[PDB]
Structure 1
């Protein structure tokens, strides 16, 4: 009847679709997430097609969303909060890693405020599952940098406050496939300008991933 989806973070009710390639996310507090998917659809559809999982439909208070892990034999997922936290500062200055596949094995704690050294160590930990082929993990890093670059650029021209949004980084164990997409629009707001805080999260991640893709 109901199979629970293996979340990396969040407090939200998320189940598998009755059907392949679909997850059902429940809207707990308001329909704001739906209102914002539709607004972005009308005003920024290029942003929606490039960076955001497809919304196939709504069923009462459930959003039917593209399952970003679906085309992967052995997905490694990392959730990074790049939007403002409701309250509390980011655990890594410009962003907060909310969790990652096998984070329990490295004693990762989402409440622990981290140095740059710990932050980078946690991202190296997340890449461990991708194995010792060094010239193949850096292909993963570089494809991530390519899309995060275009995202940061595109964010300059979008008049939204991306409160609460996360990046979902995914890579297959064999490193043949990867992607990153923006999720969680529940707390996003219209504003008269662009979101310098959310841009500074993306550019900082670009810096960190770039240092990883270049250290020998």
Structure 2
């Protein structure tokens, strides 16, 4: 009666909660992810409310988090790592696509270093389940750009190093609903300045999505 959550990337044990709208993520290595949710909650509460799934509680080593997929009939999900990797450089220069819904169909490989063209093509791949209605897909891109724009603006005033953090892009097959949020705070660190490397990941994504929203 344990139901494994269909992650798109990561190595962490994630299960469905025993009740609706909750997933349980195991803190495998340390409780640093909980320490960081609590720090952001006390120092950057606005950031937490706008950009981050709700943390409802802790049970031993499990975080009870808002299921970002819960309100969707046919969610498509993409995990894009915008914070630094442990040692390796990013597969797309400023960020790494770690996975998306149906990526096996397009021979996506998270180990593969990509050109600009292949990066753009993988984001186009992720958008294909959104069907042939250009106005509807454009509105999904424009809503993502609206929220990433405000995130990149707000990041200038946040003194955290967002190591390992991902953007979770979600849209419904019908293109009636979409969202992007920040997840995975296990390696976030306190620092004296803002994280310019993470801000460049977001502004590069805003550039790519803008080209897609505008193409003829």
Shift of 1:87: 1.4
Q: For 1:186-205, what per-residue CA distance to the aligned partner results, in whole angstroms no more than 9, with x for missing partners?
A: 00000000000000000000
Gaps of 5+ in 2: none
Dislocated runs of 4+, deviation >4 Å: none
| Alpha-carbon distance in structure 2 between the residues aligned to 1:159 and 1:173 | 37
| Alpha-carbon distance in structure 2 between the residues aligned to 1:138 and 1:102 | 21
| Alpha-carbon distance in structure 2 between the residues aligned to 1:68 and 1:192 | 31
| Alpha-carbon distance in structure 1 between the residues aligned to 2:67 and 2:87 | 29
Shift of 1:207: 0.1
Shift of 1:127: 0.1
Equivalences, count: 216
Gaps of 5+ in 1: none
Shift of 1:8: 0.3
Give the aligned partner of residue 164 of structure 1: 164
| Alpha-carbon distance in structure 1 between the residues aligned to 2:181 and 2:123 | 17
Shift of 1:150: 0.1
Shift of 1:9: 0.2
| Alpha-carbon distance in structure 1 between the residues aligned to 2:42 and 2:152 | 21
Give the aligned partner of residue 23 of structure 1: 23
Q: For 1:13-60, what per-residue CA distance to the aligned partner results, in whole angstroms no more than 9, with x for missing partners?
A: 000000000000000111000000000000000000000000000000
| Alpha-carbon distance in structure 1 between the residues aligned to 2:186 and 2:51 | 16
Give the aligned partner of residue 205 of structure 2: 205
Give the aligned partner of residue 87 of structure 2: 87
| Alpha-carbon distance in structure 1 between the residues aligned to 2:215 and 2:4 | 39
Q: Which TM-score applies when normalising by structure 1?
A: 1.00
SS at match of 1:112: coil
